[PDB]
Design an enzyme around this catalytic site. Structure first.
Site, PDB file in Angstrom:
ATOM      1  N   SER A 197       0.872  -1.185   0.000  1.00  0.00           N
ATOM      2  CA  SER A 197       0.000   0.000   0.000  1.00  0.00           C
ATOM      3  C   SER A 197       0.905   1.230   0.000  1.00  0.00           C
ATOM      4  CB  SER A 197      -0.940  -0.014   1.228  1.00  0.00           C
ATOM      5  OG  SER A 197      -1.891   1.050   1.214  1.00  0.00           O
ATOM      6  N   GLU A 324      -8.598  -5.183  -4.511  1.00  0.00           N
ATOM      7  CA  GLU A 324      -8.044  -4.053  -3.784  1.00  0.00           C
ATOM      8  C   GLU A 324      -9.110  -3.093  -3.239  1.00  0.00           C
ATOM      9  OE1 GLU A 324      -5.164  -4.475  -3.054  1.00  0.00           O
ATOM     10  OE2 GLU A 324      -3.672  -4.534  -4.687  1.00  0.00           O
ATOM     11  N   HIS A 437      -7.540  -6.197   0.301  1.00  0.00           N
ATOM     12  CA  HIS A 437      -6.338  -5.373   0.286  1.00  0.00           C
ATOM     13  C   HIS A 437      -5.477  -5.728   1.491  1.00  0.00           C
ATOM     14  CE1 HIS A 437      -3.904  -1.906  -0.654  1.00  0.00           C
ATOM     15  NE2 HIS A 437      -4.107  -1.368   0.539  1.00  0.00           N
TER      16      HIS A 437
END
EC number: 3.1.1.7
Lengths: 532, 532
Positions: A197, A324, A437
């Site tokens: 991320s 995601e 995610h």
């Protein structure tokens, strides 16, 4: 003693820890910069002055001051990410996991945690480098950096809060791994930095920034890249938010000194209480204080840097998760619930597209909706939900990363792409979320190997495969075993554009990861918004 | 005598003709307007003065002065459309096919041929109404009208060339069928007009025009509708082309009288030799002189007329062919050949999109290409060819017709939609063309029934099915047999939007004919071009 190490900053006493019915050394909480408290807030980090005696590095350090999620009290699902330690403005420490016996010159891996640049800790359970260090025989380093306003407030032009001080923090930690990891058995000329991320975005940022290039060999970026629409802002916007933040705490806004001084006199939890009020648009997947293209850390714009080949040419291994988006819709798009199938209606689908592409005019909102709607079944609740889910991921993570990988590969010395599409068996989040995610991390750190965590036998098999790819890549610049009989992870090339899926099934190679949409988001929509 | 008929315009002597080993009457070449020659050129048609004695109506009349295709000399494929009679400015005649014995008050069907408003004849072999008249027992009328400059030159504001005089021609013919078809056995209160391509557009135009509404009961539109991007222009553009045409023949352009007079002194083949030079853009599927929204024939704009419900509310039966586009790419898009698989390259595909959507800016050309390109196989010659083929059809015929049917159905009293997707077995054109534009006609007129034409047994079965739908619809306003055991052709409704395929296979009902694209062409692209 194996637990005593003599660095250039002073001596440190580590501790022996158990792992998979064996043991390894662990030096937790080593400092790499002077405490950024008091008048040092918002200011660039300064090297930690040496110390006499032995620094006790047997327990985790504190967590940076941050925003804590309380959207689901008790839920392990969201709390396994909240800080597990006392938050303090004195956060700049790093953690080292060394094998036993101590290596002479083994491979190093530096992990930069993610968190939207507004949260994150190195001390989390999921980021326990002992399993990896042990299983692959590598020195695992875990650094920390300032997040939120504390690390990204930017009043360009001043030296009191230049901006990107949070990235400098990371660079500092890398400088220390470069000047001292040799005393822990690590080889400084073979350090791989890898992130997730915002960490994946930071990794990519050190590849672009001239002042960080010389400090690492390879890189691994996961679900994130420097050119993400949420990973950076202009000095102008950075300034706008700096002021607004000040306006919310009632500060004198006559000059920067005026503002900066008022902010330094506030308690840490006060900046955090109003932090989210400074966003320019009602949005999803956008964060307040983030890196800014200042002209220093970043010479020019990111796009031109990628086009001119101005960046560290090395090998990189990167990829994305199948779903995601879902994580942000849950918390912000109307219609989604942690306890329902969350089927979304036309009205909510469109409110979804408005929240997802905050900077698009009404023409663009239509372009996005047209590209993501099956008009033969426009009121199919499950289709609108997965479509909204897809928009969020494609625009924010997947299509921006493919732009990077394609621009990079043109000047790099080797690219390896993956697509993690396996949902863990013990996940606590609903099914409609899917391959969420950040949940690929647990396989990278090998939590499947520890029985008591309840993972399927094949899942543990997947974790070892991945740890061996990452570790083998970190060592050789290629995820594959020289003369192995296993399936070869093909190299990504401008021409072929091959990539592989990463799940518990017989490796399958593919091509042009989501090109249909990556063209809409990287070529058409940008262009459309410019002319209109 | 069965072959002698006494109309209100005078007596006419028809002739007996053989059909499917039986016989029917045929009154060919009956006049309905005064010859539009001399000073009458470009001027509105005037009723034909009555005549004494018996008009000999046993042979076909002449064909209007038109542009003749010579792109494939000898090729029956293209010549079966060229005029088969002496072209002359004296063209306004109509043809009647009556059953035997003569009916008392049977159903009437008026056919308006197509041709892009620049060509067409009633006398063509494919438009022989005897097979239909005979097989279904209906009076079949076939009218003619002026095309090209001769019928669509428009200098709004003058009475010398008002414009749409070609549509008035058609209206005239309908007025005569209304005042006299009763003497041929037909029932004037049950006349169905039906057309193809420009004929389908004309049919739709009489439904919108206040002055034509009262002259027919139902309508059948095939592969064409009034709101097609090629079926009409503004007075301004009409004027621009009127002048330019004059500029090519070196005429005094000081005033309309100046211009109009010079044009009336030119030989018919001179206007035709330069006709195509007046188009505003390099294009495909666009014609020089066409109907113009003058404020007379058409009260206001077509779009607002469709939105206000300002039009003849009745029943209509309409549809399209699977591959409407191919015919125009062959003749105009670079890369296509009548004798090759015509696989198209990226370069040619894009030149294709530029020729297809002539009025789109560079942003739109990109929007069209993105919507029609499979980026997982962008250099697939067969995919780019069929995609180009699809663009041409969707934009020009299919998506404009679906806009009409959806707007109409909201105020109409019954809609029936079809999708002709059967390629005849004896077609002479290449395969890459497929279910070509206009070849559904041969089934409507029943050429499959005549053995010597070489059609499969199932094809003849299809022709009878279709003739019975059209004929049954013309009579009852419903294509279905009251108490039949056959498959029912469902009614089209705003809600369901059902339609059926029309081929030699077990009837299959469907929904939302090409909605994905019809939304791009009717909602998004229009909007995009407006804001940009």
């Amino acid at each position: 003693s194996e637990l005593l190490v003599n660095t250039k900053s002073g001596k440190v006493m580590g501790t022996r820890v158990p792992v998979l019915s064996s043991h390894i050394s662990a030096f937790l909480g080593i400092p790499f910069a002077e405490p950024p408290v008091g008048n040092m807030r918002f200011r660039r980090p300064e090297p930690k002055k040496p110390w006499s005696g032995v620094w006790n590095a047997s327990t985790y350090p504190n967590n940076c001051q941050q925003y804590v999620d309380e959207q689901f009290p008790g839920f392990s699902g969201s709390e396994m990410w909240n800080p597990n330690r006392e938050m303090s403005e004195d956060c700049l420490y790093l953690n080292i996991w060394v094998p036993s016996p101590r290596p002479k010159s083994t491979t190093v891996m530096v992990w930069i945690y993610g968190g939207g640049f507004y949260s994150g800790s190195s001390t989390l359970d999921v980021y326990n480098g002992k399993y990896l260090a042990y299983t692959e025989e590598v020195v695992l380093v875990s650094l920390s950096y300032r997040v939120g306003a504390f690390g990204f407030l930017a009043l360009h032009g001043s030296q009191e809060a230049p901006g990107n001080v949070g990235l400098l923090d990371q660079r500092m930690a890398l400088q220390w791994v470069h000047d001292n990891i040799q005393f822990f058995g690590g080889d400084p000329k073979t350090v791989t930095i890898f992130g997730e991320s915002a960490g994946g975005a930071s990794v990519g940022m050190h590849i672009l920034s001239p002042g960080s290039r010389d400090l690492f060999r390879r890189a691994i970026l996961q679900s994130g890249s420097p050119n993400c629409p949420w990973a950076s802002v202009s000095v102008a916007e950075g300034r706008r938010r700096a002021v607004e933040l000040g306006r919310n705490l009632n500060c004198n806004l006559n000059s920067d000194e005026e503002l900066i001084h008022c902010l330094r006199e506030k308690k840490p939890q006060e900046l955090i209480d109003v932090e989210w009020n400074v966003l320019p648009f009602d949005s999803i997947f956008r964060f307040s204080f983030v890196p800014v293209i200042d002209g220093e850390f970043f010479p020019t714009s990111l796009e031109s840097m990628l086009n001119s080949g101005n960046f560290k040419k090395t090998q990189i291994l990167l990829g994305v998760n199948k779903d995601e988006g879902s994580f942000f819709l849950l918390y912000g798009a109307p219609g989604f619930s942690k306890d329902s199938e969350s089927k979304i209606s036309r009205e909510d689908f469109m409110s979804g597209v408005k929240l997802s592409v905050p900077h698009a005019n009404d023409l663009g909102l239509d372009a996005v909706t047209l590209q993501y709607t099956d008009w033969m079944d426009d009121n199919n609740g499950i289709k609108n939900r997965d479509g909204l889910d897809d928009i969020v991921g494609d625009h924010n993570v997947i299509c921006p990363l493919m732009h990077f990988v394609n621009k990079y590969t043109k000047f790099g010395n080797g690219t390896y792409l993956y697509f993690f599409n396996h949902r863990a068996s013990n996940l606590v989040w609903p099914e409609w979320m899917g391959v969420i995610h950040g949940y690929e991390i647990e396989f990278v750190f090998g939590l499947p190997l520890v029985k008591e965590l309840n993972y399927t036998a094949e899942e543990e098999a997947l974790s070892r495969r991945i740890m061996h790819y990452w570790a083998t890549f970190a060592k050789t610049g290629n995820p594959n075993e020289p003369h192995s009989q296993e399936s070869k992870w093909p190299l990504f090339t401008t021409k072929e554009q091959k990539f592989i899926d990463l799940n518990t099934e017989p490796m399958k190679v593919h091509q042009r990861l989501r090109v249909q949409m990556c063209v809409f988001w990287n070529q058409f929509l940008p262009k459309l918004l410019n002319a209109t």
